[PDB]
């Protein structure tokens, strides 16, 4: 019966592929022919933020476009004023091997975790005026790889145990588990109309998950190696992904397929991080080659480059008003660009 | 602008306090030699020194040794956390799982992010290797056919009273990891082999001696003397 179920899975995958081919009118590159190119984007480092003793391994920006969080494998989690360069907090951690961090959309809380296979949440607005662990979300059976708040009560996590989970932070328990990935889940992105999220996972796949129903609407499989990075396009109808196969790729939700791939044979590096600019028109990506490429999302031209780091660009992010890019790296510095 | 000046003063005081803390923590971080500990389930890695953590000090030098215990068998993402450790300690049960140990060693050695990290190689359970070649059906010849053509190095040191067959088997298994490490070391990283068995206390000295050699060879490379 295992061969009959595997053969029916081949029949279903061939049927899904034919259903996608029925939808496949033209490559986005042809649709956008009349659109004017972006031309040479010039962005310059407007700040360097320094103070981490070891490789910065993660980021998130605040909804205020003003504070940001970064984590490093010395066991520090620093919160910065990006306008003034001042460190606002510098949280010590129980386990030094952090692999992600996040900042609640209110700015009231920060989350992080890594090889401890725990997500630890920190309150920034305590009555005692001090940062401390509000809760530890233990229960993942492999490293925490990404996490992201919906609000001050709800957090989505991603794990080396090949699952995502939704937690209620007061409860301290998994409100749902999302289980269908076959490799280590690497990264998350939440929808702007926050009812859906996407993940990519050390297999060629990205999945679109329904937050309320608890199981994936769609599986996207066009990549060629481990998806490290994922991000929604700003309307929530499409997403980018970057992987060890050195391509970024743009996927629709609504057409259930790739629209475009972003590459050069000049690039043989895994992609660590991806984000759009506010209009969606630029797709920014960080690479193992120590720099970032800025892509026209509608063309696949390299509209520019950000190149300020002595070691791997580990993380990247655009402010909620689009006013800057931040990038972190294994040399321990953040750069902010505009 | 006094409303701004009040907040600037508050951020300046916060920043300067945080920088005082980060300076003291920079001393604790730099004083401490982080190590990653690896091996199969049969490898006695839990008994080499006398995540899971193990802090020890030798001659006033702090070694902090990490074992990634409670995680999945596929490792290519979590292993990247250790690109900045001072050494990898790699532990092998001498016995057939030796080929699994060699393929694991090869993948640790050739990884893009581990290219700069020296390996301290503990070939453990040498008492079991000794008795299981003093008796038993020479099965090392069947697992590794090159053990017909191999013979001991003339720079090999026997321990007092070990039989030449034990020396032959010891130094053969040792030299396979030397074949793997020599093939691509590029002077950027080195392999430090030691023979050991579960009763040894001297392993704690051996890790300190090899961390001297790692940091010496790093300084000699930096000044173009290697």
């Amino acid at each position, epitope marked *: 019966e295992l061969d009959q179920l*595997r053969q029916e899975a081949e029949q279903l995958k061939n049927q899904i592929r034919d259903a996608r081919k029925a939808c496949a009118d033209a490559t986005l590159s042809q649709i956008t022919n009349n659109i004017d190119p972006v031309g040479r984007i010039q962005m310059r480092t407007r700040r360097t933020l320094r103070g981490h003793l070891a490789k910065i391994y993660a980021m998130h920006w605040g909804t205020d476009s003003r504070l940001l969080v970064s984590a490093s494998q010395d066991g520090k989690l620093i919160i910065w004023d990006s306008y003034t360069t001042n460190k606002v907090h510098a949280i010590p951690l129980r386990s030094s091997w952090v692999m992600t961090c996040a900042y609640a959309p209110s700015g009231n809380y920060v989350a992080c975790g890594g090889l401890d296979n725990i997500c630890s949440i920190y309150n920034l607005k305590t009555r005692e005026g001090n940062v401390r662990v509000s809760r530890e979300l233990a229960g993942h059976t492999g490293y925490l790889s990404c996490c992201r708040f919906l609000d001050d009560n709800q957090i989505v996590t991603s794990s080396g145990d090949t699952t995502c989970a939704l937690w209620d932070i007061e409860t301290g328990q998994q409100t749902t588990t999302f289980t269908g990935h076959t490799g280590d889940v690497m990264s998350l992105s939440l929808a702007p109309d926050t009812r859906l999220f996407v993940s990519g996972a050390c297999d060629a796949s990205a999945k679109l998950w329904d937050v309320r129903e608890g199981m994936c609407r769609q599986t996207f499989t066009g990549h060629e190696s481990d998806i490290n990075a994922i991000c929604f396009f700003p309307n929530g109808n499409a997403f980018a992904t970057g992987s060890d196969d050195a391509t970024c790729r743009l996927f629709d939700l609504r057409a259930d397929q790739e629209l475009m791939t972003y590459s050069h044979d000049n690039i043989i590096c895994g992609i660590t991080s991806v984000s759009f600019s506010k209009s969606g028109r630029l797709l920014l990506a960080g690479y193992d080659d120590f720099n970032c490429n800025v892509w026209d999302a509608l063309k696949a031209d390299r509209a520019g480059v950000l190149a300020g780091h002595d070691n791997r660009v580990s993380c990247l992010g655009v402010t909620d008003d689009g006013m800057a890019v931040a990038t972190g790296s294994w040399d321990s510095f953040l750069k902010i660009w505009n | 602008t006094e409303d701004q000046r009040n907040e600037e003063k508050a951020q300046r005081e916060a920043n300067k306090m945080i920088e005082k803390q980060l300076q003291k923590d920079k001393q604790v971080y730099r004083a401490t030699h982080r190590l990653l500990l690896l091996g199969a389930d049969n490898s006695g890695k839990s008994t080499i020194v006398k995540i899971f953590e193990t802090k020890f000090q030798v001659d006033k030098v702090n070694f902090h040794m990490f074992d990634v215990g409670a995680q999945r068998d*596929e490792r290519r993402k979590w292993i990247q956390c250790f690109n900045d450790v001072t050494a990898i300690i790699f532990v092998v049960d001498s016995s057939n799982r030796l080929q699994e140990a060699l*393929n694991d060693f090869k993948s640790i050695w050739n990884n893009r992010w581990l290219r700069t990290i020296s390996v301290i190689l503990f070939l453990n359970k040498q008492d079991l290797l000794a008795e299981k070649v003093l008796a038993g059906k020479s099965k090392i010849e069947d697992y590794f056919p090159e053990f017909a053509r191999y013979t001991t190095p003339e720079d090999a040191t026997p321990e007092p009273g070990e039989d030449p067959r034990v020396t032959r088997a010891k130094y053969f298994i040792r030299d396979e990891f030397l074949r793997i490490s020599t093939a691509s070391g590029d002077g950027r990283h080195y392999c430090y082999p030691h023979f050991t068995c579960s009763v040894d206390t001297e392993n704690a000295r051996r890790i300190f001696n090899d961390c001297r050699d790692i940091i010496q060879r790093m300084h000699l490379r930096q000044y173009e003397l290697l």
Partner: nanobody
Amino acid sequence: QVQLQESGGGLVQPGGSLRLSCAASGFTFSNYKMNWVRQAPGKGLEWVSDISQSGASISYTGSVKGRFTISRDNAKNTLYLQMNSLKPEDTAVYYCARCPAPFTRDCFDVTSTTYAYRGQGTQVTVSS
């Protein structure tokens, strides 16, 4: 979609010979070092052999040196294992596995119990 299908297998006599085949799709096969791994009944996965991107560098387990030969076709997107002088001890499912990232010599997870970049495998049974 990254996939590998193995072909060749079934029962064969001890002392015999058999060529395994693997066909790839969803990747530019030339960029990947590629592998055979095997699982004997009731026992763990073990590594059998490697071939590099160019086919110039190759390797085998000590049980297998001379007895099996690995080869590849970067224009057909296929990997092969020609097997000679089979022992009863070679009785296993054989899997075509790929190194995870393109352009490198490390291949950590090709022997891992679950792994994304191997085929379904084919049975090879060595008996009368």
